[PDB]
Design a protein around this ligand. Structure first.
Ligand code: MN
Ligand code: MN
Ligand code: ZN
Ligand code: ZN
Ligand code: ZN
Ligand code: ZN
Length: 513
């Protein structure tokens, strides 16, 4: 829900090298009517954080709402999600008047890379940059989603300051941290344009050694009496500026392209390059995403390419270099079959991921077995992650049907000598055989086929034989599953390992309800 900011959140100008910072001081000293050759200016140096700017509003000391920047005048109320952020106060004593604290909600570099890595082997959408990741965490209807993402935030300015005794920006930061606000660890009280450029350089050589992406520094004029005088240009003020860090893009050569199979089945590619040093670490493997990403980038195997790290962490590629291409470099013939199991590998009409059929693929085996067992499937309490891993280390089960073919002595003759718990585990098996039919298709673990899609698939036919014996046209005509879900369903049943798993399942005695 939109809300109008009390004071408008203006943007900032950008300086990239030293000469542009000198023109910045020249513009500032001129806007105040001072001799151009002056270095008496006291500054304040924060960091430009790769996140989302957020504004707070405290009336009579008590918190009212938390909103995003939006367009600089009207933001979006994220009152509940910002309160999932830890050290966020809601009541300041001895304070009366409109308080407007400004800040920035960022996301940890490790929490950021672990998300895209989760999205890489799964096929679910991926985070572009730390700003979209912070916005993707804030803009969530359920605040528990934001709480489960470790959303961390920093506040580094104040606008409407009714009842704030701070008279300089350095005392603003002191007053913020004194009231219990989460402030920036690195913020220096600078004097002179030379000390500001030195500070910016020291943050450059500390860019990689942070827990959060900082894409530059922020230089503010110390005296508030001078801030409320220099004024604004049009979109940015004349008393504060952002000094961006230099770009970090290293040129290297692409060597080999490999493919890994995700636990779900995502056929995720991977690029291997000549090991080059970026900032500090030596990057040699780059994320390659999906097939259409390669085809759009025209990444013929053997090309020389540019590469960086997304937010300073995730190594993603940039583009190709046609001037340095070999004439014999052929376009990468994308694999049509699974590399680790051999079975066919086909993708849907619109889905960019490629996926893999059923369980013979060792990358899916463990995930398919434990998904077959959970509450969302066949309800087999007793069989846990520590037990399934042993059944694969010893090699007693192949797919989910191998569980029903086990004996009481095979499960009792294991670790800790559990006889009665093997009886409880066995009882859940035959009790699962007479469970409803919709719980079976979901337990197979096909792509896109969730708990809701498996129920609509069950209402489509009703009988198990009607699903195996049904043309692709009559199964694409089901309501709920168009031409992307139903197309992924047909590829599963057309696979022999799925037909073998289902046949062994009915051979053990599965007659759904
Ligand atoms: Mn950076
Ligand atoms: Mn960045
Ligand atoms: Zn320059
Ligand atoms: Zn975390
Ligand atoms: Zn096979
Ligand atoms: Zn496979």
């Amino acid at each position: 829900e939109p809300v109008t900011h009390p004071t408008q959140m203006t943007s900032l100008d950008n300086v990239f090298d030293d000469d542009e910072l000198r023109d910045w001081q020249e513009k500032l000293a001129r806007s105040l009517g001072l001799p151009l050759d002056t270095d008496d200016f006291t500054f304040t140096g924060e960091l430009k954080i790769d996140g989302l700017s957020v504004n707070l509003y405290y009336l009579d000391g008590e918190l009212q709402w938390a909103a995003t920047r939006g367009n600089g005048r009207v933001g979006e109320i994220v009152t509940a999600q910002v309160l999932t952020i830890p050290d966020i106060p809601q009541k300041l004593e001895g304070l009366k008047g409109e308080l407007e604290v400004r800040g920035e909600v960022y996301l940890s570099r490790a929490d950021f890379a672990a998300f895209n890595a989760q999205a890489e082997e799964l096929g679910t959408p991926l985070l572009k940059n730390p700003r979209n990741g912070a916005a993707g965490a804030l803009r969530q209807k359920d605040p528990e989603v934001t709480r489960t993402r470790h959303l961390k935030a920093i506040l580094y300015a104040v606008g409407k300051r009714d009842g704030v005794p701070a008279r300089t920006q350095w005392e603003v930061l002191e007053w913020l941290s004194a009231q219990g606000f989460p402030t920036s660890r690195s913020s220096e009280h600078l004097r002179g344009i030379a000390a500001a450029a030195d500070y910016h350089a020291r943050m450059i050589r500390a860019h990689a050694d942070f827990e959060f992406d900082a894409d530059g520094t922020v230089l503010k004029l110390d005296s508030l009496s001078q801030q409320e005088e220099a004024g604004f240009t049009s979109r940015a003020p004349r008393w504060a500026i952002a000094y961006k860090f230099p770009v970090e893009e290293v040129e290297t050569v692409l060597e080999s392209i490999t493919v890994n199979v995700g636990r779900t089945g995502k056929l995720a590619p991977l690029a291997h390059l000549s090991p080059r040093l970026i900032e500090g670490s030596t990057v040699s493997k780059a994320t390659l995403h999906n097939e259409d990403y390669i085809r759009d980038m025209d990444l013929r195997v053997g090309d020389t390419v540019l590469v960086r790290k997304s937010g300073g962490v995730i190594p993603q590629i940039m583009r190709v270099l046609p001037d340095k291409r070999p004439a014999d470099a052929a376009p990468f013939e994308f694999p049509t079959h699974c590399p680790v199991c051999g079975h066919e590998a086909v993708r849907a009409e619109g889905d960019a991921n490629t996926y893999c059929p059923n369980p013979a693929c060792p990358a899916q085996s463990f995930e398919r077995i434990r998904y077959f067992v959970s509450r969302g499937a066949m309800d087999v309490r007793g069989i846990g992650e520590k037990l399934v891993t042993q059944l694969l280390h010893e090699g007693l089960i192949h797919d989910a049907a191998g569980l029903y073919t086990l004996s009481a002595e095979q499960l009792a003759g294991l670790e800790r000598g559990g006889e009665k718990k093997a009886g409880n585990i066995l009882g859940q098996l035959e009790a699962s055989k007479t469970k409803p039919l919709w719980r079976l298709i979901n337990a197979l673990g096909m792509s896109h086929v969730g708990q809701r899609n498996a129920q609509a698939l069950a209402r489509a036919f009703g009988t198990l034989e009607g699903l195996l014996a049904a043309t692709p046209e009559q199964i694409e005509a089901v309501p709920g599953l168009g031409g992307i879900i139903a197309q992924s369903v047909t590829a599963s049943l057309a696979d022999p390992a799925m037909r073998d798993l289902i046949a062994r399942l009915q051979a053990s005695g599965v007659a759904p309800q």
